[PDB]
Amino acid sequence: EALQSESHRLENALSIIEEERKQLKLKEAELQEEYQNSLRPLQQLQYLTLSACEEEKRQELMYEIGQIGDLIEDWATDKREALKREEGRIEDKQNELFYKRQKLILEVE
Amino acid sequence: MIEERLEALQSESHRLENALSIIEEERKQLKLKEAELQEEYQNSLRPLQQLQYLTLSACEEEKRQELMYEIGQIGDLIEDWATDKREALKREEGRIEDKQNELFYKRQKL
Protein backbone atom coordinates (compact mmCIF):
# COMPACT_ATOMS: atom_id res chain seq x y z
CA GLU A 1 0.00 0.00 0.00
CA ALA A 2 2.57 2.54 -1.21
CA LEU A 3 0.75 4.56 -3.88
CA GLN A 4 -1.90 5.36 -1.27
CA SER A 5 0.68 7.55 0.46
CA GLU A 6 3.48 7.95 -2.09
CA SER A 7 1.24 8.94 -5.01
CA HIS A 8 -0.95 11.20 -2.86
CA ARG A 9 2.03 12.64 -0.93
CA LEU A 10 3.96 13.33 -4.14
CA GLU A 11 1.07 15.08 -5.90
CA ASN A 12 0.94 17.46 -2.91
CA ALA A 13 4.64 18.16 -2.44
CA LEU A 14 4.63 18.72 -6.21
CA SER A 15 1.84 21.31 -6.12
CA ILE A 16 3.59 22.88 -3.12
CA ILE A 17 6.58 23.34 -5.43
CA GLU A 18 4.36 24.90 -8.08
CA GLU A 19 3.03 27.43 -5.61
CA GLU A 20 6.50 28.38 -4.40
CA ARG A 21 7.40 28.80 -8.07
CA LYS A 22 4.54 31.27 -8.52
CA GLN A 23 5.39 32.96 -5.21
CA LEU A 24 8.93 33.40 -6.51
CA LYS A 25 7.82 34.87 -9.85
CA LEU A 26 5.95 37.43 -7.74
CA LYS A 27 8.93 38.34 -5.58
CA GLU A 28 10.76 38.95 -8.86
CA ALA A 29 8.18 41.57 -9.87
CA GLU A 30 8.35 43.10 -6.40
CA LEU A 31 12.11 43.56 -6.63
CA GLN A 32 11.78 45.30 -9.99
CA GLU A 33 9.10 47.66 -8.69
CA GLU A 34 11.24 48.22 -5.59
CA TYR A 35 14.25 48.78 -7.84
CA GLN A 36 12.29 51.36 -9.84
CA ASN A 37 10.99 53.18 -6.75
CA SER A 38 14.41 53.23 -5.12
CA LEU A 39 15.75 55.08 -8.18
CA ARG A 40 13.03 57.71 -8.52
CA PRO A 41 14.55 60.42 -6.25
CA LEU A 42 17.99 59.83 -7.80
CA GLN A 43 16.55 60.42 -11.25
CA GLN A 44 14.64 63.40 -9.86
CA LEU A 45 17.96 64.85 -8.76
CA GLN A 46 19.32 64.35 -12.26
CA TYR A 47 16.54 66.39 -13.86
CA LEU A 48 16.35 69.07 -11.18
CA THR A 49 20.10 69.65 -11.26
CA LEU A 50 19.93 70.46 -14.95
CA SER A 51 17.71 73.49 -14.34
CA ALA A 52 18.99 74.83 -11.05
CA CYS A 53 22.74 74.34 -10.81
CA GLU A 54 25.89 75.81 -12.29
CA GLU A 55 26.82 73.94 -15.43
CA GLU A 56 30.52 73.99 -14.51
CA LYS A 57 29.73 72.37 -11.16
CA ARG A 58 27.05 69.99 -12.37
CA GLN A 59 29.46 67.24 -13.42
CA GLU A 60 30.80 66.92 -9.88
CA LEU A 61 27.13 66.58 -8.94
CA MET A 62 26.49 63.86 -11.51
CA TYR A 63 29.52 61.96 -10.21
CA GLU A 64 28.00 61.84 -6.73
CA ILE A 65 24.68 60.83 -8.29
CA GLY A 66 26.48 57.99 -10.04
CA GLN A 67 28.11 56.96 -6.78
CA ILE A 68 24.62 56.61 -5.31
CA GLY A 69 23.62 54.75 -8.45
CA ASP A 70 26.21 52.07 -7.68
CA LEU A 71 25.14 51.53 -4.07
CA ILE A 72 21.56 51.00 -5.22
CA GLU A 73 22.84 48.88 -8.09
CA ASP A 74 24.72 46.64 -5.66
CA TRP A 75 21.72 46.37 -3.33
CA ALA A 76 19.27 45.30 -6.04
CA THR A 77 21.58 42.87 -7.81
CA ASP A 78 22.43 41.29 -4.46
CA LYS A 79 18.73 40.76 -3.90
CA ARG A 80 18.39 39.51 -7.48
CA GLU A 81 21.05 36.93 -6.65
CA ALA A 82 19.20 35.79 -3.53
CA LEU A 83 16.08 35.13 -5.63
CA LYS A 84 18.19 33.28 -8.18
CA ARG A 85 19.47 30.99 -5.43
CA GLU A 86 15.87 30.37 -4.40
CA GLU A 87 15.03 29.60 -8.02
CA GLY A 88 17.62 26.83 -8.00
CA ARG A 89 16.49 25.36 -4.68
CA ILE A 90 12.90 25.08 -5.94
CA GLU A 91 14.00 23.60 -9.25
CA ASP A 92 16.19 21.11 -7.42
CA LYS A 93 13.27 20.08 -5.23
CA GLN A 94 11.10 19.71 -8.35
CA ASN A 95 13.44 17.28 -10.13
CA GLU A 96 13.91 15.26 -6.94
CA LEU A 97 10.15 14.77 -6.71
CA PHE A 98 10.02 14.04 -10.45
CA TYR A 99 12.59 11.29 -9.90
CA LYS A 100 10.60 10.12 -6.89
CA ARG A 101 7.45 9.74 -9.01
CA GLN A 102 9.18 7.75 -11.77
CA LYS A 103 10.53 5.24 -9.24
CA LEU A 104 7.20 5.08 -7.38
CA ILE A 105 5.63 3.78 -10.60
CA LEU A 106 8.17 0.96 -10.38
CA GLU A 107 7.14 0.30 -6.79
CA VAL A 108 3.45 0.04 -7.68
CA GLU A 109 4.41 -2.59 -10.32
CA MET B 1 32.43 1.14 36.59
CA ILE B 2 35.22 3.70 36.66
CA GLU B 3 36.06 3.24 32.99
CA GLU B 4 32.70 4.47 31.75
CA ARG B 5 33.04 7.16 34.42
CA LEU B 6 36.30 8.31 32.83
CA GLU B 7 34.99 8.11 29.26
CA ALA B 8 32.02 10.36 30.02
CA LEU B 9 34.29 12.95 31.67
CA GLN B 10 36.42 13.15 28.53
CA SER B 11 33.57 13.62 26.05
CA GLU B 12 32.18 16.32 28.34
CA SER B 13 35.54 18.11 28.36
CA HIS B 14 35.68 17.81 24.58
CA ARG B 15 32.07 18.98 24.31
CA LEU B 16 32.48 21.96 26.64
CA GLU B 17 35.84 23.01 25.23
CA ASN B 18 34.56 22.80 21.65
CA ALA B 19 31.36 24.80 22.14
CA LEU B 20 33.40 27.45 23.96
CA SER B 21 35.85 27.81 21.09
CA ILE B 22 32.94 28.10 18.65
CA ILE B 23 31.30 30.91 20.59
CA GLU B 24 34.52 32.88 21.10
CA GLU B 25 35.12 32.94 17.35
CA GLU B 26 31.50 33.78 16.57
CA ARG B 27 31.66 36.69 19.02
CA LYS B 28 34.80 37.87 17.24
CA GLN B 29 32.98 37.41 13.93
CA LEU B 30 29.97 39.39 15.13
CA LYS B 31 32.05 42.30 16.40
CA LEU B 32 33.78 42.51 13.02
CA LYS B 33 30.57 42.68 11.02
CA GLU B 34 29.37 45.30 13.48
CA ALA B 35 32.24 47.65 12.68
CA GLU B 36 31.82 46.62 9.05
CA LEU B 37 28.29 47.98 9.24
CA GLN B 38 29.22 51.25 10.92
CA GLU B 39 31.83 51.68 8.18
CA GLU B 40 29.46 50.76 5.36
CA TYR B 41 26.84 53.09 6.83
CA GLN B 42 29.13 56.12 6.75
CA ASN B 43 30.57 55.33 3.32
CA SER B 44 27.02 54.95 1.97
CA LEU B 45 26.26 58.51 3.07
CA ARG B 46 29.46 60.22 1.91
CA PRO B 47 28.06 61.01 -1.59
CA LEU B 48 24.78 62.20 -0.06
CA GLN B 49 26.59 64.65 2.18
CA GLN B 50 28.77 65.68 -0.74
CA LEU B 51 25.63 66.76 -2.58
CA GLN B 52 24.32 68.69 0.42
CA TYR B 53 27.58 70.63 0.47
CA LEU B 54 27.84 71.05 -3.29
CA THR B 55 24.24 72.14 -3.84
CA LEU B 56 24.62 74.99 -1.36
CA SER B 57 27.26 76.69 -3.50
CA ALA B 58 26.11 75.79 -7.00
CA CYS B 59 22.31 75.74 -7.10
CA GLU B 60 19.60 78.38 -7.08
CA GLU B 61 18.33 79.06 -3.57
CA GLU B 62 14.66 78.77 -4.54
CA LYS B 63 15.22 75.24 -5.91
CA ARG B 64 17.64 73.68 -3.42
CA GLN B 65 14.83 72.83 -0.99
CA GLU B 66 13.43 70.55 -3.67
CA LEU B 67 16.84 68.88 -4.00
CA MET B 68 17.27 68.44 -0.24
CA TYR B 69 13.88 66.71 -0.19
CA GLU B 70 15.07 64.17 -2.73
CA ILE B 71 18.32 63.77 -0.78
CA GLY B 72 16.27 62.96 2.29
CA GLN B 73 14.27 60.39 0.35
CA ILE B 74 17.55 58.65 -0.41
CA GLY B 75 18.81 58.89 3.15
CA ASP B 76 15.64 57.08 4.19
CA LEU B 77 16.54 54.22 1.89
CA ILE B 78 20.06 53.89 3.28
CA GLU B 79 18.53 54.20 6.74
CA ASP B 80 16.25 51.23 6.17
CA TRP B 81 19.02 49.18 4.58
CA ALA B 82 21.31 49.77 7.57
CA THR B 83 18.79 49.36 10.39
CA ASP B 84 17.59 46.08 8.90
CA LYS B 85 21.22 45.05 8.70
CA ARG B 86 21.55 46.27 12.29
CA GLU B 87 18.66 44.07 13.34
CA ALA B 88 20.21 41.06 11.63
CA LEU B 89 23.35 41.56 13.72
CA LYS B 90 21.27 41.94 16.86
CA ARG B 91 19.68 38.57 16.07
CA GLU B 92 23.09 36.91 15.86
CA GLU B 93 24.05 38.43 19.21
CA GLY B 94 21.10 36.79 20.95
CA ARG B 95 21.78 33.46 19.26
CA ILE B 96 25.25 33.36 20.78
CA GLU B 97 24.00 34.56 24.16
CA ASP B 98 21.44 31.76 23.91
CA LYS B 99 24.11 29.12 23.33
CA GLN B 100 26.01 30.60 26.27
CA ASN B 101 23.04 30.39 28.61
CA GLU B 102 22.27 26.81 27.57
CA LEU B 103 25.81 25.91 28.58
CA PHE B 104 25.71 27.78 31.90
CA TYR B 105 22.43 26.75 33.48
CA LYS B 106 22.80 23.00 32.90
CA ARG B 107 26.11 23.22 34.82
CA GLN B 108 25.57 25.86 37.54
CA LYS B 109 28.01 24.00 39.82
CA LEU B 110 30.23 27.10 40.34
User: Please, how many CA atoms are within 13 Å of residue B95, restricted to the half-sphere of its CB?
Assistant: 12
| B58, amino acid identity | A
**What proportions of chain B, in percent to the nearest 5, are helix, strand and coil?**
95, 0, 5
Helix (H, G, I), strand (E, B) or coil at B92: helix
Q: Which residues of A touch B67 (CB under 8 A)?
A: 45, 48-49, 52
Taking the alpha carbons at both ends of chain B, their separation in whole angstroms is 26
CB B51 within 8 A of CB B67: yes
Q: How was this structure determined?
A: X-ray
Between B51, B59, B81, which is nearest A75 by CB?
B81
- Asked if B74's CB is within 8 angstroms of A52's CB, the reply is no
CB A15 within 8 A of CB B22: no
Residue B84: which of A58, A59, A75, A69 has the closest Cα?
A75
- Asked if B54's CB is within 8 angstroms of A64's CB, the reply is yes
Residue A65: which of A78, A81, A77, A53 has the closest Cα?
A53
Helix (H, G, I), strand (E, B) or coil at A54: coil
CB A36 within 8 A of CB B77: no
Give the Cα separation of A38 and A69 in Å (integer): 10
- Asked if B66's CB is within 8 angstroms of A48's CB, the reply is yes
Between B44, B58, B64, which is nearest A71 by CB?
B44
Give the Cα separation of A12 and A59 in Å (integer): 58
Residue A48: which of B49, B50, B68, B52 has the closest Cα?
B68
Q: Which residues of A touch B56 (CB under 8 A)?
A: none
Closest-approach residue (CA) in chain B for A64: B47
Helix (H, G, I), strand (E, B) or coil at A109: coil
Q: Beta-carbon neighbour count of residue A84 at 10 Å? A: 11
Residue A56 DSSP one-character state = T
